[PDB]
Amino acid sequence: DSVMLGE
Amino acid sequence: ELRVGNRYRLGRKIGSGSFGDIYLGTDIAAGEEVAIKLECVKTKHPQLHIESKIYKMMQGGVGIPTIRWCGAEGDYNVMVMELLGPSLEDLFNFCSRKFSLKTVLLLADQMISRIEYIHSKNFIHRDVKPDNFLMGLGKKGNLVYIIDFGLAKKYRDARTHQHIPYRENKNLTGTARYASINTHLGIEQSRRDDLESLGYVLMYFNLGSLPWQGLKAATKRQKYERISEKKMSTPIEVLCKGYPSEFATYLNFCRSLRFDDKPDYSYLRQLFRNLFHRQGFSYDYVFDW
């Protein structure tokens, strides 16, 4: 979740 | 057989960009391979045709992929582009997640240039990260391309060059591992933040890993708070210990740029060019791979 695009 | 634009045969998924999946494609007319980005036509927040207009404003710039065809078909908005080579994340993995100093310095020079060029066209990228740089093909194999303008935005007015206003308390969308500190604080991004993220990318290539990477949490935002406060509680001098001081000078310079400052790109590029020559390397473009 640290290199996924997110908020 | 499955064809978009009645010309580009569709192939396997080869990645997933922002607001859209990327597919391998073949130009049945030429035999040329292409990249195909897809966006569902019935999305509530359409982007692909904006991203393709930005790609069109960026054409001619060195290291900018060409757009072959843009359109709509079936369930999708369609954007067909030039297929490039591996990404810098791919190649980093190919080299057992270690780059020579010389390769870091060759890449740093070209990545500052790509970013400065986007800035000269009135846009910030806002998703600077290894997957978003790709090497060229054949005779352009030594050239670093920048891709994915799905989060790009104007930072200044195209005729007055009036900078976009300062804002705080924004819930921003980026890549947590490489985002600048100011983005973690809710501040409107600007030119300084692209170059700060590049600086973390440089240290990532240097270390194999970042201190705030690979942390344990449950919820997603509380995994983000843990990244945010480990990044903030890690002084640049401790993140860059054991490495040439140009990497710390670089990062220190980027955090002390003001919101609307024009970065001194030539200074930053010169930092790394001077160390390159002091180390005795030669700019023969021979990368590790």
Side-chain angles (χ1 to χ4, degrees), chain A:
Chain A
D1 296 61
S2 52
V3 202
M4 192 134 165
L5 73 168
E7 286 163 66

Side-chain angles (χ1 to χ4, degrees), chain B residues 1-133 135-289:
Chain B
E1 83 169 342
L2 185 43
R3 309 216 196 125
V4 317
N6 222 67
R7 192 162 53 197
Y8 306 105
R9 159 155 80 53
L10 191 87
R12 73 155 84 215
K13 187 191 255 83
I14 73 195
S16 38
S18 64
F19 305 120
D21 271 326
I22 294 139
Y23 290 77
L24 192 271
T26 314
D27 196 331
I28 69 161
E32 189 212 12
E33 308 274 295
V34 298
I36 310 186
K37 186 172 191 180
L38 301 183
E39 178 194 62
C40 187
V41 278
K42 283 144 177 230
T43 170
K44 285 307 133 241
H45 309 86
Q47 326 273 15
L48 192 52
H49 297 264
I50 291 169
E51 160 163 28
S52 75
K53 289 307 186 189
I54 292 167
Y55 270 106
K56 271 311 272 172
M57 294 177 256
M58 304 281 162
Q59 303 303 328
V62 152
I64 303 276
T66 313
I67 309 281
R68 298 250 175 292
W69 188 82
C70 196
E73 235 182 303
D75 307 323
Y76 296 101
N77 295 322
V78 175
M79 168 169 77
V80 188
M81 292 182 310
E82 189 199 334
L83 186 68
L84 278 35
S87 80
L88 289 191
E89 177 67 23
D90 296 335
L91 292 162
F92 193 58
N93 282 316
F94 186 84
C95 305
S96 323
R97 312 189 43 93
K98 33 177 108 182
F99 279 159
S100 61
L101 179 58
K102 170 189 180 155
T103 283
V104 178
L105 294 183
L106 293 173
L107 291 172
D109 189 51
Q110 283 200 53
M111 289 163 81
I112 301 155
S113 188
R114 305 306 91 98
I115 284 167
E116 184 190 353
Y117 173 85
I118 288 171
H119 291 169
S120 82
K121 309 284 254 212
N122 312 315
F123 285 81
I124 51 191
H125 190 283
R126 301 201 289 136
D127 199 13
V128 173
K129 74 173 162 198
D131 283 284
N132 274 349
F133 294 93
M135 296 312 296
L137 286 193
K139 235 162 150 201
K140 338 295 311 172
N142 56 343
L143 181 58
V144 186
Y145 289 76
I146 185 152
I147 63 164
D148 201 343
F149 288 92
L151 291 189
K153 64 169 294 184
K154 258 176 193 161
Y155 73 93
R156 75 185 176 182
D157 191 84
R159 310 136 60 146
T160 67
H161 279 359
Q162 176 151 8
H163 203 280
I164 52 162
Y166 182 85
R167 305 285 189 234
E168 336 171 29
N169 212 280
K170 300 281 135 168
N171 180 290
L172 306 156
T173 308
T175 293
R177 195 193 277 168
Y178 304 103
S180 60
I181 305 264
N182 288 336
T183 71
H184 283 305
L185 291 154
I187 296 147
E188 186 86 52
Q189 300 138 294
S190 79
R191 289 173 293 198
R192 59 190 186 158
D193 295 285
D194 285 347
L195 301 169
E196 180 168 336
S197 303
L198 169 48
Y200 298 141
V201 165
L202 299 169
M203 280 317 299
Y204 168 78
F205 291 159
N206 277 338
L207 286 149
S209 160
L210 291 174
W212 47 85
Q213 145 179 18
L215 289 183
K216 173 78 202 234
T219 324
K220 267 178 281 297
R221 206 242 199 194
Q222 273 146 325
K223 206 177 194 272
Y224 290 144
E225 77 177 6
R226 225 178 264 209
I227 291 198
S228 172
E229 197 72 29
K230 180 80 181 115
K231 201 185 290 208
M232 276 174 200
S233 85
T234 291
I236 290 171
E237 282 64 22
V238 164
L239 159 74
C240 296
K241 190 212 252 181
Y243 291 80
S245 71
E246 272 83 356
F247 293 97
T249 307
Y250 180 95
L251 270 168
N252 272 331
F253 181 91
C254 288
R255 286 247 287 155
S256 78
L257 284 171
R258 297 171 304 238
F259 176 62
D260 70 324
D261 268 346
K262 171 184 181 299
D264 184 343
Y265 308 93
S266 179
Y267 171 67
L268 298 185
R269 282 194 298 262
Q270 202 50 50
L271 283 182
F272 294 130
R273 282 204 209 247
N274 279 343
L275 168 70
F276 187 95
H277 282 285
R278 245 201 293 112
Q279 293 287 329
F281 308 145
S282 38
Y283 255 103
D284 54 4
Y285 288 90
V286 171
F287 298 99
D288 284 358
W289 58 89

